[PDB]
Amino acid sequence: RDPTLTLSLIAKNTPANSMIMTKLPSVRVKTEGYNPSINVNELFAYVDLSGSEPGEHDYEVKVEPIPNIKIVEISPRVVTLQLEHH
Numbered sequence: 001r002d003p004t005l006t007l008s009l010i011a012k013n014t015p016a017n018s019m020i021m022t023k024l025p026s027v028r029v030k031t032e033g034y035n036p037s038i039n040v041n042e043l044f045a046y047v048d049l050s051g052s053e054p055g056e057h058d059y060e061v062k063v064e065p066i067p068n069i070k071i072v073e074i075s076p077r078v079v080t081l082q083l084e085h086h
Helices: none
Strands: 005-012 018-020 027-033 044-048 055-060 069-075 078-085
Touching: 044 055
Parallel strands: 005 044
Antiparallel strands: 005 027, 018 078, 027 069, 055 078
8 A cells, every 4th residue: 555644743852841932844754565554643753852952953753663564755854943941
């Protein structure tokens, strides 16, 4: 089926006492494989803010593991976000 998915972007490990000022864009993912029972809306792409300081930085977009599916393309691949200390 090699489904093309549209996933919402989620931020992981957002530093405590800090807030993301940027609205996270959606992500388009091309895949290879088959899977009839995997909730698309329950699937997410993510950016890992582990150890980030306030300001504007670029983060690599990644995809949460999906059974029987291999991610072959992710757009956008990188996202620019702004972080502000509380």
